[PDB]
Structures are given as structure tokens and as C-alpha cells.
Amino acid sequence: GLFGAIAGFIENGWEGMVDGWYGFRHQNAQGTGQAADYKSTQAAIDQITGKLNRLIEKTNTEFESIESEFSEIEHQIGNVINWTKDSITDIWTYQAELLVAMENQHTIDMADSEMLNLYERVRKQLRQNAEEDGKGCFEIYHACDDSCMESIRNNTYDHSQYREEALLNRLN
Amino acid sequence: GLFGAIAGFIENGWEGMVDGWYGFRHQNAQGTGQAADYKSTQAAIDQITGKLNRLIEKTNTEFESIESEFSEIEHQIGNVINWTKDSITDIWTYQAELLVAMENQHTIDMADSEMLNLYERVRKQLRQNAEEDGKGCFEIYHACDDSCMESIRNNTYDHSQYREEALLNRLNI
Amino acid sequence: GLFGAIAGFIENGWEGMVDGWYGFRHQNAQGTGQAADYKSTQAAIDQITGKLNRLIEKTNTEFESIESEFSEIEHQIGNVINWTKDSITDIWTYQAELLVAMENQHTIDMADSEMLNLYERVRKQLRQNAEEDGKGCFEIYHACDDSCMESIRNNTYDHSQYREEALLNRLNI
Amino acid sequence: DKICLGHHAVANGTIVKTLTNEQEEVTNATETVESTSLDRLCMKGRSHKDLGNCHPIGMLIGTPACDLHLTGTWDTLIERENAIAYCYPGATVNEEALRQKIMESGGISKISTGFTYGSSINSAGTTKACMRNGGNSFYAELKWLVSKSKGQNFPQTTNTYRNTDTAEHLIMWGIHHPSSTQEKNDLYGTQSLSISVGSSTYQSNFVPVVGARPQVNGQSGRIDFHWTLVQPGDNITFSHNGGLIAPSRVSKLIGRGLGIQSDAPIDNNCESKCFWRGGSINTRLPFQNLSPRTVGQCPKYVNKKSLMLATGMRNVPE
Amino acid sequence: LDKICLGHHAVANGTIVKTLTNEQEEVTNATETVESTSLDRLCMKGRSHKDLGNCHPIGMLIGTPACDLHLTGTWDTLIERENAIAYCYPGATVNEEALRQKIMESGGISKISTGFTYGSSINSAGTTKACMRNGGNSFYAELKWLVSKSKGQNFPQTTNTYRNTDTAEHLIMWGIHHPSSTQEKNDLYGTQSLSISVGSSTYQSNFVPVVGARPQVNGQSGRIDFHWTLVQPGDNITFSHNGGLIAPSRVSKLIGRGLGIQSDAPIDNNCESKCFWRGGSINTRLPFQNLSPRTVGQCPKYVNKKSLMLATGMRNVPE
Amino acid sequence: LDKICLGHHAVANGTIVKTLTNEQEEVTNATETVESTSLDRLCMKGRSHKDLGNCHPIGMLIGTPACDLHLTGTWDTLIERENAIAYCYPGATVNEEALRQKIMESGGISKISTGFTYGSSINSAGTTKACMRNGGNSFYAELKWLVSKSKGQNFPQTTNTYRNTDTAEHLIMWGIHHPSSTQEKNDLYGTQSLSISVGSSTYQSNFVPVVGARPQVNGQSGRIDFHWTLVQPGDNITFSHNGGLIAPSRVSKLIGRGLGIQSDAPIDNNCESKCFWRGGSINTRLPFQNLSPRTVGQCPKYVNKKSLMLATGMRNVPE
Numbered sequence A: 001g002l003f004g005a006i007a008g009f010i011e012n013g014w015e016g017m018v019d020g021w022y023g024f025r026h027q028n029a030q031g032t033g034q035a036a037d038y039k040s041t042q043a044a045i046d047q048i049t050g051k052l053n054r055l056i057e058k059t060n061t062e063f064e065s066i067e068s069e070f071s072e073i074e075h076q077i078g079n080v081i082n083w084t085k086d087s088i089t090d091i092w093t094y095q096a097e098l099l100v101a102m103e104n105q106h107t108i109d110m111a112d113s114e115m116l117n118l119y120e121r122v123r124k125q126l127r128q129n130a131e132e133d134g135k136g137c138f139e140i141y142h143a144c145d146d147s148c149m150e151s152i153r154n155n156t157y158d159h160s161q162y163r164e165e166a167l168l169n170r171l172n
Numbered sequence B, C: 001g002l003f004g005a006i007a008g009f010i011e012n013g014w015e016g017m018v019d020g021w022y023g024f025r026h027q028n029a030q031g032t033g034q035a036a037d038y039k040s041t042q043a044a045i046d047q048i049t050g051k052l053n054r055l056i057e058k059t060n061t062e063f064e065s066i067e068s069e070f071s072e073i074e075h076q077i078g079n080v081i082n083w084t085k086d087s088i089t090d091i092w093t094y095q096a097e098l099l100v101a102m103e104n105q106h107t108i109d110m111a112d113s114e115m116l117n118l119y120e121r122v123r124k125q126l127r128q129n130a131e132e133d134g135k136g137c138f139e140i141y142h143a144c145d146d147s148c149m150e151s152i153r154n155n156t157y158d159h160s161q162y163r164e165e166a167l168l169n170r171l172n173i
Numbered sequence D: 001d002k003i004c005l006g007h008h009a010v011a012n013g014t015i016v017k018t019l020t021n022e023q024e025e026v027t028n029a030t031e032t033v034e035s036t037s038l039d040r041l042c043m044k045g046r047s048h049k050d051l052g053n054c055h056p057i058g059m060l061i062g063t064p065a066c067d068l069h070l071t072g073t074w075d076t077l078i079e080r081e082n083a084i085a086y087c088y089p090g091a092t093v094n095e096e097a098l099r100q101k102i103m104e105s106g107g108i109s110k111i112s113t114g115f116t117y118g119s120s121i122n123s124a125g126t127t128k129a130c131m132r133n134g135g136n137s138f139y140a141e142l143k144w145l146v147s148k149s150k151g152q153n154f155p156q157t158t159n160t161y162r163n164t165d166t167a168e169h170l171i172m173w174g175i176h177h178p179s180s181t182q183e184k185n186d187l188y189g190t191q192s193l194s195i196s197v198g199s200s201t202y203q204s205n206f207v208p209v210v211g212a213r214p215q216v217n218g219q220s221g222r223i224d225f226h227w228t229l230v231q232p233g234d235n236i237t238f239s240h241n242g243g244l245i246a247p248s249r250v251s252k253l254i255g256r257g258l259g260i261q262s263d264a265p266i267d268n269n270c271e272s273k274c275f276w277r278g279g280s281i282n283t284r285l286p287f288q289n290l291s292p293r294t295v296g297q298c299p300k301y302v303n304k305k306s307l308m309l310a311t312g313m314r315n316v317p318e
Numbered sequence E, F: 001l002d003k004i005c006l007g008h009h010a011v012a013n014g015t016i017v018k019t020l021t022n023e024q025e026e027v028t029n030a031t032e033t034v035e036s037t038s039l040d041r042l043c044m045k046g047r048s049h050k051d052l053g054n055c056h057p058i059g060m061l062i063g064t065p066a067c068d069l070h071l072t073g074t075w076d077t078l079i080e081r082e083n084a085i086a087y088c089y090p091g092a093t094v095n096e097e098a099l100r101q102k103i104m105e106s107g108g109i110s111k112i113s114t115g116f117t118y119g120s121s122i123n124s125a126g127t128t129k130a131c132m133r134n135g136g137n138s139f140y141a142e143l144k145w146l147v148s149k150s151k152g153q154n155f156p157q158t159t160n161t162y163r164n165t166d167t168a169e170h171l172i173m174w175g176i177h178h179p180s181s182t183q184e185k186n187d188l189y190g191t192q193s194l195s196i197s198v199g200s201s202t203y204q205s206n207f208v209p210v211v212g213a214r215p216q217v218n219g220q221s222g223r224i225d226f227h228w229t230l231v232q233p234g235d236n237i238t239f240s241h242n243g244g245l246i247a248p249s250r251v252s253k254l255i256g257r258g259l260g261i262q263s264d265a266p267i268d269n270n271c272e273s274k275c276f277w278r279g280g281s282i283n284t285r286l287p288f289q290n291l292s293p294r295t296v297g298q299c300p301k302y303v304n305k306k307s308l309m310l311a312t313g314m315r316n317v318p319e
């Protein structure tokens, strides 16, 4: 994808994640866990909603009939009507196909962009206390208990508190 | 946005930066200051200019009348003309709404990425002499006077020069 | 451009690279090398191929004649037929210019994307063993022979093996 | 210790087309082309008229089938297949133009022409094709004028309708076309026949065709209809010397109404703004594939079985 | 610890625009794509134009008094006003709109004499009170009302043939009178039964005078209907007539090309424009327009929208 | 330090394309989207086709000598040429273009005999030096010119009825003679008054021979004008007339659908095609085309554009 995360350096999605589009998994001495991210999930959802709203909005042009269902039409004007109607249909069929294909390209790359935006947000939080494993995780160079993992999810993690421990661990 | 900078990791814009679209704010022993970046600004403006030229260039197509303003059209042909005209109008209304919605989505994200590209450029200039704070600022681990600051914006900053001073300060030594 | 790589921090392209769209050029004790990346090159090509496939899908809309080439047309109906056709032409001419301009913007930006995605893949692999030079290369702080270079390209490079050597060289010890 | 980022996925994704890929799997998607139709006419919120056996034109001239539809108001007008317009065989000049004007309207008012004739001319001519409760009758808005002295020449008689109303009225008249010479002479005498119709913005002369032809409903004689609009303040004189089907009343089309040609049954419980020959189309989707011939406020027709719009990310299962 | 920071500009409050995802998206700047304004004038600078006034286009070919100043000329733009006059004597043209559009598509008119001559038992100077020039009975300038010289006498079999000797097609009109009664018909054309045949090599048709009582229009129950056709280079057109023909004394030649406008808007020679409608002129450089779906010239495309704002700046994130 | 650089390919000189933001964007490769090349020849491979050459489609139904080879047949494609002849003897058809389209919409023509017969007082084999065959005088093959057996005598009142006893509608055609002078009329049909009245269950009309002087086309001042109608299965059509009718010996039946092409380009049975225009064929997988707005078949849409290059590669950033 364009932002290289979904179907990118993140190898696959989590089918066990029901309460969100994006989220965290963690691992420490106490165990493993999983929570969803609200801000990033809603950013994607809201953007999808906007499109759906544009899709369903009414076009009020009321059209009358120009083709008797139950009787004959004069030949020359019939061939004219047919030409025009078919040309109009080719236009709409084309426009429709183009609309969706473009929108689908955008929704997909949009969702990719929000996954990345979360990842970047966390990268900058952890500063010099962690390193990227390249599969979409960060290896933390200090004991980060559950209350510490929670701090990172809730964007309250202060890097400076764990810096001296983390740095010496990274350097031996 | 798409590139996570504008309305993203940068909290808000600067209403005081009138001389440019993108730019810098510094802070040092001497004081604070502000300066626009010309290159990233023009990059954005030129791309906008290119959209406006596509928009205003004239479709010469000459059309003449097929409906009399002042006299009565025969009913069946008038109905056919009406049906056709309304169909043509519905198409161009959809096309117009789509053009603008999409071009807008693009200009926003385009502008977002020119901010990100400026940030990335600077990150790479500074190399190992500074750290990211997460809000679009780089905390520099050495004495960077006014002249040092303008070198970073001017893109003549040589990271070698301040490297060990910075590494020492980044590891408390 | 959007992603900052092609016609961005990478100064220019390589005319000597003929077996791929994206690749590597390395430098070590032995000497230099060069190699094309397969996956990144295919991503770009497959996506272009999909655009071409959509370009040449035919519609079975069989149209007949409504204007005689050799006899004369009644004036009112001919003026109507002219008005309709020219309106359809204007729509398709506009549609065609918008398709091509929109695809071209995306194809270019997509190309930029795959270059960046490759650079990003490499940076993460190298971890704390190399530093970015701002021009698309990675200065590596340890002996990395053609076997080591191949493992970076093959995506089998284990940063553990050189971490100590590299880290010592980076901090100057 | 470790913190991993990720996204969701599903066991069963859905395929969609994109710019670069025909076969792209996403977590979820929704249809943009409407495939379903309600095979009935959704007339809730509509003061509607079901003509049934009555054909729109029949309303103006007054065929037995159209007695309950000679006047009225409506926002929706429903025509059915094989609706009877002419009991006595014939047709109307510019029949389709006239039909559309009626289906474009929201009602009909009838106004009396006040036409009254000499004793030489008998207006009470009926036929076996247009019966009413057993006995023979005629189009209720017209009269058949013939000589009561059979064989004698049809008088040079004038009739004039003036439009005093602030709106244009629709006047109709008919010309009889005998099946032979002997017949033609019986009714309107031996002379060569002509019928003029003059108004300030319309003139046209009509001459009866005569010749042996097939029996449509046991009738070789034809009665064809002509019509024009009479503007406010103008009048329309009828000079005729034989074979005029003269109007006792004239029509006035009121408001605007949506016309619907369909045989599907009526439902007063559902409502709809898009109709076609097969029924109604209730959908918030912007496209449909049911028919390129619809009336009302409709989704645009496309040649597409389906077009799924992605409502989620690229699906990347475990 | 000294520091450098990266940002983007902003404004107090910018404009709102639409996107694929957001109805209400605030940006620093924008601009309109749909034209709402129109000049209630007809911008005619750089245009050789003809304002027909009360003269209807068809009135130029047949020569209604109202058109005396519009019988010849050359223009690139031709303007028609409402309620303009074509017929002084009551009547209608067959395929009137086709003819009108044809004239309004043109860039001038030339007139060529038929030179039609008649016997002395024909009065070619018939006149009417409906067509007046200086309080005196007159007639359509380019035609001639033919009636028997001596009242009541039978109108003689006459033949007149126009020859196109030009390198371009000419446009010929003639008329057919329909008297008010059989009594009048016999004064003008006699007791005959009347036929009027017209034929070239591209066209031929017959005409019989309708006779019937009908409402007076300008004090006239009689009617004169007009018919027309094109006569190719080198071809000839023949009139075989025994009474009832309104014969051409001149034929017309449409010249070149021009733009035809139906509007009552006043003329301005100081503004220029390429797009027009009933209400006047539109000279915008925007691609779209919400004034009318009925326009002529090189026009922006009509849309059902008040406004469509195009972003010319980033998202506004204010302080 | 050891170094590993990332890069991308470039070329000597690339191709220019347009983007949303740039008219002059250089990329590594591009392909055209608008077809400019026509094959100046009709690609008829895989088509059971008919070249009318000098025959005009209407002539097929009436039997002009030029159309002798094309009175019946079947086809999926029908080719018409410029200056093609319909009328050896001068005249025209009512609703000429509607009829021509119907034939060009078809895929074959069966012929069926009306089986009309005439008395000794009528000569049913009228001929003319306008429609020649073998140098000798002839007439339209599907019609018969009926005239009085003895020059000057009155034409006898006659009734001919064609009964359709088929499962499908048939296309009947007839004609009317318009004599060039009084004496001609009186010779052919007599001094009596002449009326031709046709009558089906869904069509009836009346016709009168327009006598009158006119230019000679192919050396004929007379005219035969054609009318047509569709007789329905079971329904019968009846002709009452006393001279001046050009009666049919055969009616027509249109078989299946076919493509109609108007072009003077030469046929080529080696290439195949689904799109055609006046100047030849268009074989292309491209979605757009700028040869002509008038085309027939399954065609790329016409655009008012010379070239539209689609980018098939990245930005070209040369060394």
C-alpha cells in the first residue's frame, strides 16, 4: 500500500480484535494483552461515513417519459431517442465504475495511513527508550508493567522517567 | 491527515506567519525568532497554481439554439429536448461536485505532505545531534546560536561539527 | 512529490540500472556492487498493469447511424442531433482529460511510495548499526562484505551480530 | 518487554475493484447499484388516478370506457396496456404528442362549447360500436352531424367557440371517412365536401377520404381526430358543409402530474418517487440496473450487475 | 536546552469546502468554480451585429413593412426580440422554426430579382390595409398579390420560372391566399377550380386554396400561408398557376455564418462576450454556471448548484 | 564506512504527460489513450456483407435497374455508397430517410407478389427511356405503370387488394404519376377527374396527380412520387383508383437485424472490425478516438483531442 503498513511491514491483521479497527498488543513479565485505539479507529470510521453520506444524497431531477410503453414510436425519432439514451447510459456506467474504483483506492490507502499515524505517534512517545523490530512492534529496554503499557496507550508515557534505565540497557 | 502532520502531530498553525506557508520557530540563549521556508512554500503554491490553470482554460465549443425563447416548440420534440437537457445537466452537476470534492481532498493531503517532507529533511540534517519531541520540534543537544540556527534553515548545517558534544549530552557526560 | 523520495531526498535516478525500477548500490572493502529489488519493482509494475487492464476493457454498446452522410437532414432535427452529439463529445473530452491527469498523478505518487517503502524496510533492518546520510544511503558502522550486503537485500540481516562493533564505532571508542 | 501495533481482519472478506486491482479483498463493502424492484405501484401520499380500461385520449372525447374519468384532479396518472380510446375505429393526428400532454397534467376540466344546429342537420347520430347499457350511443364530448333528409346536401352551417377564460383550452373535433360513395351521399349529400377550422393562431382544411376498406369492429367507415389549443380571448370558427364530428365540450388541462405506463397493481401502503413498467423502485442507492426507461426521481441506469464500495481496510487474514 | 520547531501558517477563520470525506472542512483559502453573476446587457464589442427590433427574421425574406431596413445586410451576430413581426396580413409559414433557425444561423442576406412578368389581364399590384407604408395600402415588398385585372373574370393560366445562375443555393418563398368566402374567391380568381403547382428538380408540390369563414385578424378573415424551398446552383423552379399564388418578385441568398440571439436585453458596444442567454451576457473564466440551461455561444457548462468552492490552501488549524 | 545506497531507474529522455498539477511532467514511459489511425478500407472479414455499389437502399424495394443485383438477399452488414441511385425516373419518397434507416437497420429482404391483375382497357406495362434495360425502355421492376389501353380514352375505375397471409408485417410501396402537362394527363388517363384512394385497417389516404410544368431531370418533366406503409399479418390493403397509380407487383419483407455503413472506402476481406466511419474502419483496444464523431458499431468514444499520454512509469529524474 501507499503507507506501507497494512499488507506492509505489519504482516497481517488480528481477527481476535472485535472492538476496534486499530489497536495494541503487548508483552511483559505479567503476561500479554490487547486493547483497541479509539482516536485512530474513529478517524477511519468518520471518513468512511462521509463517503457513504455523499453516495446516498438525493438528486431531485424529476424526469418524464419520452417513450410509450404501450404503443409505437415514429421510426426516425425512436432511433434518435435510442442513440441518446444509450450514450447517456455508457456515460453513467463509466462514471459509476470510475467513482467506485477511485473511492476504493482511497479508502484502502486512507486506512493504511491511520495505522501508520498511530505507529508514528507511539514511536515519538517512546523516544530513546525503545527500538523498532520492523514487524510493527517496539522492543522496550526497561521493565514496562501493565500500568506502564496502559500509560503508552493512553498517551501519558513520560520517556524521561525511564531514560537512564533504557539507555544503559541499549548500550551494555 | 494522510501524512499525520497538519491536524496531526503538529497541534495547530501559526496565524503570525504571514510571509510563508511553512516555516521554523527557534529558541536559544540569544532568544526566539521565526522564519518561512521558501522552497516548501512554492512547492505547495505551484501545485495549486497548476490546478487553477486546468480549471480556467476554455472549452471553445460553440453551441447554437435548439429551443425558441419567443415561440412555441412542438410538444414531442420539446419533451425529447427537455429530457436530453436535464440529462446533460445532471451529468455536469455530478462531474462538478466530484471534481471539487476530489481536488479538495488532494490539495489538503498534498499540503500535509509538504509539511512532513520539510520535517523529514530536517530530521535527517540533524542526524544524531537532536531528538524528536513528538509535536514537530527537535530538542537540540548542543549550543546552537543564531548563526547555527540559520544554517539549519539554509541547509548548510554540518552535523559532524557538533556530534560528540551532542552525544555526550544525550548520555550525560 | 507526495512521499518525498523520487525527485526528493534521492537526488536523481540511475540510467545504468536496466533490470529493475528500484534497487541498491553498495560500497565496502571488496569494492562496489549493484542489484535490483524484485518485490518493489513488481508492486509498481503490477499496479500499472491493472490500470492498463481497466483502460482497454470494451463495452458492447452497438450504436447505429442517426445522420446520413450522403443525403440531407431536416433542419430542426439535425440541429438537435448536432447539439446532442457535441454535448456528448464535450463530456467525453473532459472525462478523458480528467482520467489521464488523475491516473498520472497517482501513478507517479505510487511510484514514489514504493521507493520510500523500500528505504523504510531497510532502515528498520539496520536498526542501530547504520545512520542515514540524507541522500538515500545508509552509512554502516561495521565490516559488511558482499555476503552481508546480500543479506540486507535478501531481508535476512540479523542486526545482533554487528550491534557491538557498530555501536562502538558510532560513539567512537 | 514489547508493544505491538496492528489492525483487525475477518475470516470472510469481500472482493472489490480499484484503479490498480480488479480482485482486492477488503474487510467489508456495500452495494451501489439497486437490483430489486417492488412489482407494484407505491401510491401512498399521492392523489392518483387508475384509468384502467380508459385510454388517456378517451377522456377528452368521452368513450364509454372513460365515463368515470371525464374530469378530475390528480398528481399521478396511471395508464394500462390495451386501454380503449376509440370505440368507433380511427386514430388521432399527433396521437402521442396529445397523449403526453394529458399524462403531463394534474387534472381535466370540461367546458361547454354551446354549439347548436339547424333542423336540417341532425346531431343525434349514434353507432353500434359505442354502446352504453345495451342501447347505441356516441363519444360523449362530440356529436355526429348528418342530414335528416337522407341524400340531400349537408347545409352550409357555421359554429363558433370563444375562449373567455384566462387559460388555453384544448378543443377536439373529428372527420368521418365513409367506406363508399353510396354511403357518403346518403349522409352528407352529393357535393364535394370541405371542412375549415379557423382560429387566430391555427388554420387547416379537411377533406373526407372515401374508399372500401376492412371492417374494424364491423365498421369500414373511419372517424379520425384532430386537435389544437385555443388561446385566451380567441375564438375558433367551424365552417363545414358535411361530415364534421362537432364538439359539445372542450377540455382544459390543470396543474402538473406524473404519468405512469404500467400494469402492476396498486399499493396505498408503500410510497415511491421512481416508477417503471415493472413497478416501483424504493432505494437510496444512486444507480440501478432494472431498466433504462423510468419516470420520476430515479437512480441513474447502468449496465452493471453490481458495484461494491469499500467500507473498510484491506483484509489480511491469519 | 535550545530547540527548533516546524509549523505551518493559519488564519483567524478561513472558508469552508467539501471533500470526499467531509461536508464541512475548513481551509485557509478557497475560490468559486460556479458562475452566479450575469450582465443584463448584450455585449457586442468586436461584433458586426444587427438588432432586428420589431422585425421578425422571416419578415426579412418576405419584406413586411417592419423589416424595410432589414431586407439586405451582412453581420456576424443577429439579435431577435420578443413579439417581433413577420406577418402584416394574417398567415403562417410551413416549417416556420426550421426556417427561423436557418436565418439566425446565417451571416447576411442578399436579394435577387425573379423578374416575373404577367399578362395584362393580371393585376400584379394587389395591396391590403394590413400592410401599410405611409398611411397607404401596401404589400410584402418581396412578393406580389396576383388577381384578375377585371373583377369577376377567370384568372388565366400563367407560368413563371426562376433560374439560379449563381454559384450558391438561393432561398425562395411564395404564398398561397385562402379567401374568406366563395364570393370573394370569384371576384379575385373567377369561377374556376384552382390549382397551383410548384416544382424544381429537388422539390415539387401542389396547392389548393382553402375557402372558409374564420375570425378576423387585423380586420382580415382571409389568410396568406407561406412555403419555401432551396434552389440549387444551375437549377430552375417553375410555378404553374391559375390564381391564388402570391408570387416572389425577389428571392433570398443566405450568406456565411453568424450567431443568433433571442433576448430583450439592451446592447452594449463597450463590453465583449462569447456567451449569451435570454437575460443577457456571461463572460466568466469559470468552467461552470448556474444562470440558465439555455445559452448560446462558447459557454460554461450549466449546473444545479449555488456554489462549489475549490480549496487553494491547507487545512486551517487555528489557535 | 561501508555504505549501501537506495535508488531508482531513469532514462536518457523520457515522455511528457499532464497531471492535476503539471502540464509538463516528465516520466520514464507513457502510452497513448486516443486512437488517431484509421484503416482507409472497410474490414469485412467474418461478415456476410452486401456492397450496394451504385444501388441506393430504397431502390432495392422498388427495383431500379441499378439495384437489379440487390432486390433480395440476406446479410449482417449493408454498405451504401455516395451518389447511389434510387430513382431512374424523377421523384422522391415520403418519409424518405425513415425508410432508408429501416432498410439499413435490416439483415435481408424477401419479396412477395401482390398478384394484382388488370383488364384489357388498362395497359399494365408502361415503360420509359429513363429506366433502361438492355438499351430498351423499362420501368421499376417491383412496380407497374398502369395507363389507358387507347391513347386519350378514360382510365377505368379499378380496385386491387393485397392480402397479407403471413406471420409478419410486410412493406408495401406504391407511386403516383404527376403529369408534365394537361395533354399528357388526358392522353394517359383521360379527361375525367382523377382520384387514388388507398385503405388498410391502420392506414388510409387520398392522392391527386399534380399536373404542371417543371424542369427535366434525366429528360423527364413528369414525376413519380412514392409512398409506403406497413401491412400487418392478416390485414388487407385496398387500392381504389381511376388512373395515375403506380401499382406494386411485389411487396417487401425485412429479415433480421444488420449493421448499416455509409462509406466509399474499399472493402477488405482480410481484416475484421466492429467500428466504422465514412473514411474506413477503426481497429483499436483504446477507449478514445479522434477520427470522427459520426461512427457506427462498437466504437471508442470520440474526443476533441489530438493526444492524451497515460503515464506507465515514475518521474524521470535524469543524471
Ligand SMILES: *[C@@H]1O[C@H](CO)[C@@H](O[C@@H]2O[C@H](CO)[C@@H](O[C@@H]3O[C@H](CO[C@@H]4O[C@H](CO)[C@@H](O)[C@H](O)[C@@H]4O)[C@@H](O)[C@H](O[C@@H]4O[C@H](CO)[C@@H](O)[C@H](O)[C@@H]4O)[C@@H]3O)[C@H](O)[C@H]2NC(C)=O)[C@H](O)[C@H]1NC(C)=O
Residues within 6 Å of the ligand: C074, C075, C076, C078, C079, C082, E168
Ligand atoms: C450539423 O452539423 C454538421 C457538421 O458540422 C453540419 O454540416 C456541415 O456544415 C456545412 C453544411 O453546409 C458544410 O460546411 C461547408 O462545406 C462546404 C463544402 O466543402 C466540403 O464538403 C464536404 C461535405 O460533403 C466536407 O466534408 C469537406 O470538408 C469539403 O471541404 C464548404 O465549401 C463551405 O465553406 C463555405 O462555402 C461558401 C459557399 O457557400 C463560401 O462562400 C465560404 O467561403 C465558406 O467557407 C462550408 O465549410 C459541411 O460540409 C457540413 N459537414 C458535414 C459533415 O455534413 C450541418 O450543417 C449541421 N446542421 C444544421 C442543421 O445546422
Ligand SMILES: *[C@@H]1O[C@H](CO)[C@@H](O[C@@H]2O[C@H](CO)[C@@H](O[C@@H]3O[C@H](CO[C@H]4O[C@H](CO)[C@@H](O)[C@H](O)[C@@H]4O)[C@@H](O)[C@H](O[C@H]4O[C@H](CO)[C@@H](O)[C@H](O)[C@@H]4O)[C@@H]3O)[C@H](O)[C@H]2NC(C)=O)[C@H](O)[C@H]1NC(C)=O
Residues within 6 Å of the ligand: A075, A078, A079, A082, F105, F256, F257
Ligand atoms: C429503439 O430501441 C428499442 C429497444 O432497444 C427497440 O425496440 C426493440 O426492438 C426489437 C426489434 O429489433 C424487439 O426485439 C424483438 O422482440 C420480439 C418480441 O419480444 C417481446 O417480448 C419481450 C420479453 O421480454 C419484450 O421484452 C419485448 O419488448 C417484446 O414485447 C421478438 O419476437 C423478436 O424476435 C425476432 O428477432 C430475433 C432477432 O434475434 C430473431 O432471432 C427471431 O427469429 C425473431 O424474428 C425480437 O427479439 C424488442 O421487442 C423491442 N423492444 C422494446 C422494448 O420495444 C426499437 O426497435 C429501437 N428502434 C429502432 C431499432 O429503430
Ligand SMILES: *[C@@H]1O[C@H](CO)[C@@H](O[C@@H]2O[C@H](CO)[C@@H](O[C@@H]3O[C@H](CO)[C@@H](O)[C@H](O[C@H]4O[C@H](CO)[C@@H](O)[C@H](O)[C@@H]4O)[C@@H]3O)[C@H](O)[C@H]2NC(C)=O)[C@H](O)[C@H]1NC(C)=O
Residues within 6 Å of the ligand: B074, B075, B076, B078, B079, B082
Ligand atoms: C420543457 O421544459 C420547459 C422548462 O421547464 C417547459 O416550459 C416551462 O413551463 C411552463 C410552460 O407552460 C411555464 O410556466 C408557466 O408560464 C408562466 C410562468 O412565468 C405562467 O403563465 C404560468 O404560471 C402559472 O402558475 C400557477 C401554476 O403553478 C397557476 O396557478 C397560474 O394561474 C399560472 O398559470 C406557468 O408557471 C414556464 O415558464 C416554462 N419555462 C420556460 C423557460 O418557458 C416546457 O413546458 C417543457 N416542454 C414540454 C413540451 O413539456
Ligand SMILES: CC(=O)N[C@@H]1[C@@H](O)[C@H](O[C@@H]2O[C@H](CO[C@]3(C(=O)O)C[C@H](O)[C@@H](NC(C)=O)[C@H]([C@H](O)[C@H](O)CO)O3)[C@H](O)[C@H](O)[C@H]2O)[C@@H](CO)O[C@H]1O
Residues within 6 Å of the ligand: D124, D125, D126, D127, D128, D129, D144, D146, D178, D179, D183, D215, D218, D219, D220, D221
Ligand atoms: C339501417 C340498418 O338497420 N342497417 C343495419 C346495418 O347497420 C347492419 O350492417 C352493418 O352496418 C354498419 C353500419 O351501422 C351503423 C353503425 O355504425 O353501427 C348503425 C348506425 O345507427 C348508423 N347511424 C348513424 C347515425 O351513424 C351508422 C352510420 O350510418 C355509419 O357508420 C356511417 O359510416 O352505421 C356497417 O356498415 C357494417 O359494415 C354493416 O355490417 C346490418 C347487420 O346485418 O343490419 C342492417 O339492418
Ligand SMILES: CC(=O)N[C@@H]1[C@@H](O)[C@H](O[C@@H]2O[C@H](CO[C@]3(C(=O)O)C[C@H](O)[C@@H](NC(C)=O)[C@H]([C@H](O)[C@H](O)CO)O3)[C@H](O)[C@H](O)[C@H]2O)[C@@H](CO)O[C@H]1O
Residues within 6 Å of the ligand: F126, F127, F128, F129, F130, F137, F145, F147, F179, F180, F184, F216, F219, F220, F221, F222, F223
Ligand atoms: C411517342 C414518342 O414520341 N416517343 C419518343 C419520345 O418519347 C422521345 O422524345 C422524348 O420523350 C421523353 C418522354 O417519353 C416517354 C419516356 O419516358 O421515355 C415515353 C413513354 O412511353 C411515356 N409513358 C409510358 C407510360 O410509356 C413517357 C411518359 O409519357 C412521360 O415520361 C411522363 O412524364 O414518356 C422525354 O420527354 C424527352 O425529353 C423527349 O425528347 C423521342 C426521342 O427524342 O423519340 C420518340 O419516338
Ligand SMILES: *[C@@H]1O[C@H](CO)[C@@H](O)[C@H](O)[C@H]1NC(C)=O
Residues within 6 Å of the ligand: E029, E030, E031, E312
Ligand atoms: C485566495 O485564492 C485566490 C485565488 O483563487 C486569490 O485571489 C487570493 O489572493 C488568495 N488568498 C491569499 C493568497 O491569501
Ligand SMILES: *[C@@H]1O[C@H](CO)[C@@H](O)[C@H](O)[C@H]1NC(C)=O
Residues within 6 Å of the ligand: D160, D162, D234, D235, E215, E216, E217
Ligand atoms: C370571434 O373573433 C372575431 C375576431 O376577433 C370576431 O369578429 C367575432 O365577433 C368573435 N366572436 C365570435 C363569437 O365569433
Ligand SMILES: *[C@@H]1O[C@H](CO)[C@@H](O)[C@H](O)[C@H]1NC(C)=O
Residues within 6 Å of the ligand: E163, E201, E234, E235, E236, F215, F216
Ligand atoms: C434550367 O434552365 C436551363 C435553360 O435556361 C437549362 O440549361 C438547365 O438544364 C435547366 N435545369 C437544370 C436543372 O439545370
Ligand SMILES: *[C@@H]1O[C@H](CO)[C@@H](O)[C@H](O)[C@H]1NC(C)=O
Residues within 6 Å of the ligand: F029, F030, F031, F312
Ligand atoms: C513502455 O516501454 C516498455 C519497455 O520499457 C514497452 O512495453 C513499451 O515501449 C512501452 N509500453 C507501455 C505500456 O507504455
Ligand SMILES: *[C@@H]1O[C@H](CO)[C@@H](O)[C@H](O)[C@H]1NC(C)=O
Residues within 6 Å of the ligand: D214, F163, F234, F235, F236
Ligand atoms: C382479409 O381478407 C380475407 C379474405 O377476403 C378475410 O377473410 C379477412 O377477414 C380480411 N381481413 C383481415 C383478416 O383482417
Ligand SMILES: *[C@H]1O[C@H](CO)[C@@H](O)[C@H](O)[C@H]1NC(C)=O
Residues within 6 Å of the ligand: A048, D028, D029, D311, D312
Ligand atoms: C459493513 O457491513 C457489514 C454488514 O452490515 C458490517 O459487518 C459492518 O459493520 C459494516 N460497516 C460499515 C462501516 O458500514
